[PDB]
């Protein structure tokens, strides 16, 4: 499992695989681990897939309830609170084999500045949580082979496709240093999948885009 | 890991994979796990990487220096024990995390039947063999989908090229359910290994054949 | 321990079989692990029989009270939840030796498309479910077999009677390589017993066409 | 596993089956698990197949060793003290998970009255031993069922047929009532295997005449 | 401690002996284990005797305080759950060395034929019923000699008294084989007791009769 | 177990029991216990039956071949001490689960009276051995009750026969209240057996008159 | 510790960093982790530094005594082998604490074509060698990122010159990502330390060109 | 992490630096470990990052609460005990490794001299506290050898200017000797936080003072 989250002049990107496996057993070949919480929220969970869809379905109704509730959407502090909150009340069923680990991808609307307006938030084991300054992330099994992957590739981003293409080569590289993170399927035809959000809200990527920057990467590689 | 062994009328052939792992990180590409002990006989060993190397090089040795010192070679039941006394001596090694388990290839010279000439003999980790009698076998950690596979694709078998196809389609299917075996490489070039066992003697397949009956695996799958 | 699930243009079938064994001494020839929950939804349970048992009648009374109090049945993610959260409470009893594990199949009458209204549900022990998209699956100590073996039986699948005999053979398969599994009896005459949904609900197959494909099978085998 | 000795006026028949599992997985079909070991006496092991072969084959070269270098055979005696000899030997390797009972048959030549010259000889894991006085014996994990179907079969022997046929019917019932033993396969063609020894020697018996009461006794129950 | 049920055309019999023991020293030698639970129902039970005794005389309180609180008798099924739910509260007392297992014997008088009406229901240490339909069952230590005795003897079952000296059969040799179970006494007078159920009620069995088949057993057994 | 051994003007009278049990299951119906060792010499051993058959040939052939040595037998304190240095090599051996206790019964022909030259010698567990004086003593699980039956009946102990009927009472008096020891078989035929050494040397006792004082002993009781 | 090796057209280059660490706390500064073997091998070993430094001059003494011995140097093959039974052998002090890691690059003197002659060999803790094919190694707790680094920075290897700066740099990436790696010290003026061979020997690099390296590397990324 | 604290004649000043580790990895560069509790007030906890925030805002909340709900501040003896009993409530957490150690500095507004108005107070981790009366203290894993670096440097201070150089000087002492401090980065431009406390209130110092400070230092070192 490989999530990364990345940011360009305008929003930010994130992306992620889509192998589940058991052991060293293939269990799942389409699994979808990129959620979108709210309009200018992303959220992407590592671990236990059971324990992951649990935490992403009670985050977003939590946030919809306070939205409700109060006639007003939270700030972004307010949200890193509350999965801060929610991280470390897992702590107990974290030992013992039942542990999440989230990223946090977003776009705050009360910024001054529209240019800087995409944060990245990480987060570990304890319910500490860190604002990233470095302009990357990523998060899982297979997260050093894609930063250190993005830390080279990091100079070409210019704009949302430039980011794009530099997370599917960061995923391609994790996907071929790491044997539990599923790489592009050309039999089958299945891809990972993105989601960017910008000034006009958080938007999935189509897959036929990610379809053509695999293959042109891939035929780079070749 | 998986390596497989069949029987078509004429002779034997076998098959293996390149990739080696540690844990869930990949460490090897292009391995070799099949070799040629003598002029009618292969081994295929799994496990761990040094024991394997270290085993069939002392065969290797054994069944030479028997050679050379009596003027003729065994036969082979003779192979067949000298291997479960070097299985069976591993047993104290092979608890604790020292394990190789072989697979073992032939083709007998003094059979009255030139047709009915080729075995497959098997072993367990206490030194326990058993020879074949339904034709085919497979050795490792995928070896149950691939003999899954050939029981269905083993009605195909005609000769030599038949055998090697099926021995290449029972390995991508292992590699398609296994995580810790390789499968074809496109990008790299790199491609199972194979060996073929007739009246003739022990030949490695070249790799050019392999490549294409691969290709035409994938094709037929897409 | 063995049942099976898989789709047909039209509806699901799913299938299962008649062994209780204690150890390695077999203590029940005409054990059923296979019940229509409602008027579109069937259910297997593998494991402990009485947990399974209480499992089943649970989860009926269940559906038949909420249907009864709002009047108008739940739709089937709601269902899906249900059956997750039961799973998901037996963790602790799960664990130390009493453990159950569910299969599920269903047909959806608010698809656009009757003909892609079959759906095949599989949880794991934490409580985790996933939606099937290759259109089979199979659970119990002998799935891997049943699975390898529908995995090149699938192409022959047209309607329900194809499907029907498919699942027989994957049966006959799990059977043949797991002794856990209760093969067809001839003696006495006891055969794995099947469900099939459609548009029209969910009818019990009758047992002599049950018979018939199984001596069917048994004479192309032989 | 399950092995079988009987005597009928005249000498002594022993039978076994083939079925070699691996906890609950069918590892063989068709292990033969019967050895003859000299002219007048044969063997069966159960438990680990390796050291079922190993003492087999080093019990028949002490014979034949002896016989060779006194130029006189042993007595029965002997061969029993030899025999308990080899098997207390094993007690420190029998604890720990590597354990093998035998069960001998045998025909006394040096007897006053040839008609009673059937000797049975059952073992246990300390090394005692104990001559049968009922006129039948069963050693494996089915021994239970095998020696009880004999106690009602058993007034029914008068010579060899009317033994090997008692011999197969409570083989039958041993698989009958055990799933780690091997029953009659009509659609592959195993049976289990017969030796019979009288006045004149131990002979293996022919396959067909195995198959015909197999058939026989399947008719009957049916 | 052995306890046998049975069927008969007209209805069921069960049987048990009188042996009580602490290890391996005789504790005592007249006790009853067998009772009427109410005008159609018998119960037997195996292992503690405090606790067999309170869950004897538990269930049949519960069973008179319902027929006296609904003016009605409870229907076969709710029994069975009744006396599951009791054997499943048992579980933790079960584990640690306070063991009960029940067997219940009884006649349906709302079955369509009244032919067949007796119904046999044996338990598991977890609360799982099974309802057997086979025609005889056994519980207790030696139960598998007297059910390898009732797989033979069942053939000559025609009425109520074929099925009590099959019965008294089933125990004698249970006995013969095992030393936990009490044999016939002819020095004291003690025979196993008996209980016989059909379209009239529950009736117990007078000694004379018991004594007569043991006397004649024993004659034929010399 | 229980052997039985007391002294009358004349001699001494050793007895013991058939029963062979694994647990609670019996294993052996006609096991003889008791052996004479010398002209003079009876032992009887109790525990794990290959350690006793391996302690009574080996002090068989040790005694033998110190007479041939020699050209003169040892003395009763010899013979203690020989035994008692045997067991007391096996104390390793006796812990963890191979125990063997023996009990000698002689007649001394060096005493200067032939009336009181009957001696029994008793043995412990570390080697330790004691000369009784009270003129009986009992070894095994069921010594107690048969050491409290001889403190009542050997007032009537005054010749070869009586004390021979005391030891049959004390020997049934244990099979009553020990579950481990045999009793009289009438529906086979079998009775203890016993040894009688007086001044003429060690003679087995015939089972016509151990069968006749058994057949008294069970009328009177009766 | 990171010690990295790389192949360019007519030879290898090996470098090493200088930080000595005690848990937490620095303990050296200026330590030396390669070694000039022989004229055409070197040796880097990662680790224990006693072990290190022993495991250096215990092999470079054996491979000059053989070399006196034998009067002809030791081909490659010979050198890994003798370097991998050294491994194998501290295999128990490997475990519960002295861990000593090598890695081997040399030029072959033997092979046809001298351009390709530079090999590198890589181990494992239980004693298996590698033969690198990619072109780059990497050994340490900072391996991962260093060798990541090369994965993107090998395209620019031309000669000595471009290879000995990729080392560096990658040197640099793995001391910015490890704590346990010492960077370039400008303060004081210590720099990593590498070893050139080709065809011509072994030589080891001035300081001046590392420090001029070092000096070009940190403007370019300041 | 090290953060110290010093006294000046009119205030105090403290200092802290910016790595996170995890192990051996850097996980954070800009971390910010000194806080602003209130206009008189600031306090710097080293340990796990989680916990330190926590304290950190749950002490300036509880302070804020008191102020507005009495209308007056807290002295300084209520401060320290409030954040005594915060410290003593998390030793059961501070055990299995969740552990936090405060230290904090102060200006006394009621203090009779201005000069001497300055406080620093250490905490354990069983929640005692202790007034320093020698003018410095130091926190963290790398305390010792700053506290060694100020017994040397404290002479020199006169004003805020030379107590900010003294502090700069013993955090650059301290990330010299240990590992897990970080030191200046010259290539990113990040430095340590130093906070000012004087009778005018608590002042955070510009980034270009610290920037400067330490290019001497590093110069004077050079
Ligand atoms: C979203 C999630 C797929 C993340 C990934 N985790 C897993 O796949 C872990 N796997 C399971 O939890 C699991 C899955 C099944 Cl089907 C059965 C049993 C188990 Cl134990 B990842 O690589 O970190
Ligand atoms: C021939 C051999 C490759 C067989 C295969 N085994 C392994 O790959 C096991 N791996 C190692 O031994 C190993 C390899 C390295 Cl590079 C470092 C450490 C370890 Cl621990 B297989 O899949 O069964
Ligand atoms: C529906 C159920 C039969 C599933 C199967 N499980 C079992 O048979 C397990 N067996 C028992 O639970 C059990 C049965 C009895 Cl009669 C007595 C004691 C025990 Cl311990 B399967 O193969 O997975
Ligand atoms: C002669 C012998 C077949 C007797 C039987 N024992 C076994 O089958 C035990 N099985 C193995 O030893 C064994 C066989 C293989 Cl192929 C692989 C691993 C193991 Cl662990 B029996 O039922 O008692
Ligand atoms: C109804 C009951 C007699 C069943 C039987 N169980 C027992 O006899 C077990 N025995 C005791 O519980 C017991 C009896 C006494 Cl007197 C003292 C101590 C103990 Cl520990 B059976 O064979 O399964
Ligand atoms: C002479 C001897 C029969 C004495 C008696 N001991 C035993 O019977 C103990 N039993 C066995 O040793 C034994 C017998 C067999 Cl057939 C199989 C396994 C075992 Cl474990 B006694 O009651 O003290
Ligand atoms: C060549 C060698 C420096 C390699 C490196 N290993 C170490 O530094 C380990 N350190 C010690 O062995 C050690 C050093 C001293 Cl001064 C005192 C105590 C110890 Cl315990 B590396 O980073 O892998
Ligand atoms: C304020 C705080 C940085 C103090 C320092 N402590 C730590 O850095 C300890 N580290 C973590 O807690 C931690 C950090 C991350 Cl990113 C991930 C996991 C862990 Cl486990 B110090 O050196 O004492």
Chains 1, 2, 3, 4, 5, 6, 7, 8 share one sequence.
Do not use: C
């Amino acid at each position: 499992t490989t999530i990364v989250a990345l940011k360009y002049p305008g929003g930010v990107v994130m992306a992620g695989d889509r192998r589940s496996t058991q052991g060293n057993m293939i269990s799942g070949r389409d699994v979808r681990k990129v959620y979108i919480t709210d309009d200018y929220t992303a959220t992407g969970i590592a671990g236990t897939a059971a324990v992951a869809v649990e935490f992403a379905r009670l985050y977003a109704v939590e946030l919809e309830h306070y939205e409700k509730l109060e006639g007003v959407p939270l700030t972004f502090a307010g949200k890193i609170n509350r999965l801060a909150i929610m991280v470390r009340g897992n702590l107990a069923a974290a030992m013992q084999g039942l542990l999440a680990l989230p990223l946090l991808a977003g776009y705050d609307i009360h910024a001054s500045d529209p240019q800087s307006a995409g944060r990245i938030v990480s987060f570990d084991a304890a319910g500490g949580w860190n604002i990233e300054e470095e302009g990357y992330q990523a998060v899982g099994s297979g997260s050093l082979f894609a930063k250190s992957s993005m830390k080279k590739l990091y100079s070409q981003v210019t704009d949302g496709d430039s980011g794009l293409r530099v997370a599917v080569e960061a995923l391609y590289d994790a996907a071929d240093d790491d044997s539990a993170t599923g790489g592009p399927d050309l039999v089958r035809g299945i891809f990972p999948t993105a989601v960017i959000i910008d000034a006009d809200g958080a938007v999935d990527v189509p897959e036929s885009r990610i379809a053509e920057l695999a293959r042109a990467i891939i035929e780079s590689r070749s």
